[PDB]
Structure formats: structure tokens, C-alpha cells
Amino acid sequence: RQKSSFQTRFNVHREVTPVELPNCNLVKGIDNGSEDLEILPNGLAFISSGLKYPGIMSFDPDKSGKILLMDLNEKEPAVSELEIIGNTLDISSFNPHGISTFIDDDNTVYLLVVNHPGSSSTVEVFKFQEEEKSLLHLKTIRHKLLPSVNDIVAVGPEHFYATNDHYFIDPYLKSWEMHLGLAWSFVTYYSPNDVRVVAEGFDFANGINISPDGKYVYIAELLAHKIHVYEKHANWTLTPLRVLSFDTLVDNISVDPVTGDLWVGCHPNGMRIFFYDAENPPGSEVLRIQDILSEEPKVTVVYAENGTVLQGSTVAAVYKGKLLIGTVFHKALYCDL
Numbered sequence: 001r002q003k004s005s006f007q008t009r010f011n012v013h014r015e016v017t018p019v020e021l022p023n024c025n026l027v028k029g030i031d032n033g034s035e036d037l038e039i040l041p042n043g044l045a046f047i048s049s050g051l052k053y054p055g056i057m058s059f060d061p062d063k064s065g066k067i068l069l070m071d072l073n074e075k076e077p078a079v080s081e082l083e084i085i086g087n088t089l090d091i092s093s094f095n096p097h098g099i100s101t102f103i104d105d106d107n108t109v110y111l112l113v114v115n116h117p118g119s120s121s122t123v124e125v126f127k128f129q130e131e132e133k134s135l136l137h138l139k140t141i142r143h144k145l146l147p148s149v150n151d152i153v154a155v156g157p158e159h160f161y162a163t164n165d166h167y168f169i170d171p172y173l174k175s176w177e178m179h180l181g182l183a184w185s186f187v188t189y190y191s192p193n194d195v196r197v198v199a200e201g202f203d204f205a206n207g208i209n210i211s212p213d214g215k216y217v218y219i220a221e222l223l224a225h226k227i228h229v230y231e232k233h234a235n236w237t238l239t240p241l242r243v244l245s246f247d248t249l250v251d252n253i254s255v256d257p258v259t260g261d262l263w264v265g266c267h268p269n270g271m272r273i274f275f276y277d278a279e280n281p282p283g284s285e286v287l288r289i290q291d292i293l294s295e296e297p298k299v300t301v302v303y304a305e306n307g308t309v310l311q312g313s314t315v316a317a318v319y320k321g322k323l324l325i326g327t328v329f330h331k332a333l334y335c336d337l
Ligand SMILES: O=c1ccc2ccccc2[nH]1
Pocket: 035, 053, 056, 150, 206, 222, 251, 267, 273, 274, 314, 328
């Protein structure tokens, strides 16, 4: 009964059938995670890195996190570290997790970044200064309905849906909440005048994103192996539309703005990503989901492996025939499709 729910939540028997791509390279300079990433229309890619998550491996617990930038229009894109400026943020404790971008009517680019300084959660709002390759911190957002934020999707400069992957803030309590299988994780709509729960009762809600026309919201429920599709309404509420099931732990969801396809980074075996073992490291798996509203969504494994190259894939996105894949605490891979 408990064996058994544990073995299925954590997919503890799963081994990964490989699925290769013609030409993949490790992104040089990423060795401490690349948990989330987001690619602008112009090919600039933001990557958050250095996440320290309780119970989870990290190779440099003393180094603070960073937001990296890659220009994917380059033949061999090199990463650089974005300089964060401003006096409203303590960088010494920057511990970045999910991110999302919003482009205003004036073409100002805002970056929203989930941050875990100590045990806590905030969402930091930055303005991207392209010529300078820097991030100007604008605002720290925190809220009782954002106790344990995993990812967000922005729908304005300080308006977003956020997944909380746990109900509790304290990591000792979170650990009990997860192992007891309470499924109290929930999703919050945040805006300046109006903050509310929009969906609830998830077993580790994680990735979240939105269709390019703004009518559907997708939420990954990691330990249930589901992605939930909701209709999103003009008053910002969500209503359940459908649920897809997978044989893998789904992490972050990227949405291709031309087709609306989902690109999902996934953990084939949960035991390996939650209990790190250098000799038995977590693998990587990327799904593409097409026609997600149709009667049978088309799901393809685009890339899959056991960890000998890339460990703990959480996120994948595409840009002009290339695929960039990030991980919780390891490296990043850039691939021809
Ligand atoms: O976004 C996250 C954050 C932590 C984490 C831990 C184990 C597996 C997947 C995870 N995803």
C-alpha cells in the first residue's frame, strides 16, 4: 500500500531506453545546474543556475546562483553570467529556480525569477538591459500564497501563475509532507491587487506555462506523472480541461510560440534524482507534445539517456532546429534536432 505508492510515485524501477540526437554538445561553463531556461523571440536564452534545493545534490553549496545568458543565433553559443545590479536584492544569497519572461508593449523585457534565499520563496522581478548584458532588480515579491514556489509563468511585469511544489515552507515539514503523499501543493495567481489560489491538491506541482494565445495553462504534477491542461479565462481563473499521464516524472514545461507544442524536461526515475548516487546518477528525458487539445495528443520522446552525458534534465526548449536542455544541479546540453 505504501511500498507501492512510493514505488510508483518515484518510478523507482524505470530504466531509460535511449533516444539519440545527431550532434549534442555540453554547454561549456554550466556545471552547477541549469534548472530553468527561457528563450526570447530573438534567440537570447536566459538560464538560471546554481540552485540549492533541500535534500537535493549540489556540487557547490557555497557558490551563489546566477542567471546566464546564451545567444542561440551564434554557431557555437558561449554562456555569459548576467550582472545583477540594484540595491533592492542581496545577491550573496541568490538561489534561483524557475523563471519566466514578459515583454511589455514598449518592448521592455522583464525576467521573473523564483528565488530561495534560505528556506524561503520570493519571486524577483528584473528588467533585462540588453546592451549591457545586465539585470536591473526592480522588486521582491513574497506572499503567504507563495510558500514554496517552483516555477512561474508571467502574464505581466508582476503578474504570474506560480506553482508551489509544497504547502509547507519549512524543509523538515516539506519532507514529511512529500513522503506522506498529502498532495497539498497548489497554484497561485499573483497580481498587485489580487492574489488567489487557482488550483490545488497536486502531488508536487512543478512546471507551468501558457499557450501562445493565453487561453490554456499547463501544469506539470511531478510525482503524479501528469500534465494538467486548464482553460484560462479573461478573469484569470482556471478551469480543468484535461489531464495527460506519462511514464516519467514531468518537471518544467516550455511552449513553442509558433506551434504551441509543449517541450517537457523529465526525470525517468525518481529515486535517482531525489537520492543522488554518483555511481547511479539520474538520467534525462525530453518529450514533445503536439495537438494537446486533440483527442489523442501526440507525445514523442525526442531525447533520452541514462546520465552518462546529462544528469537530471528539468527543462528543454527549441530555437531554429536546436534543442537546449537544462538540469537541476549538473550540466546543460545543446543539440541539433
Ligand atoms: O524544480 C525542481 C526542484 C527540485 C526537484 C527535485 C527532484 C526532482 C525534480 C525537482 N524539480
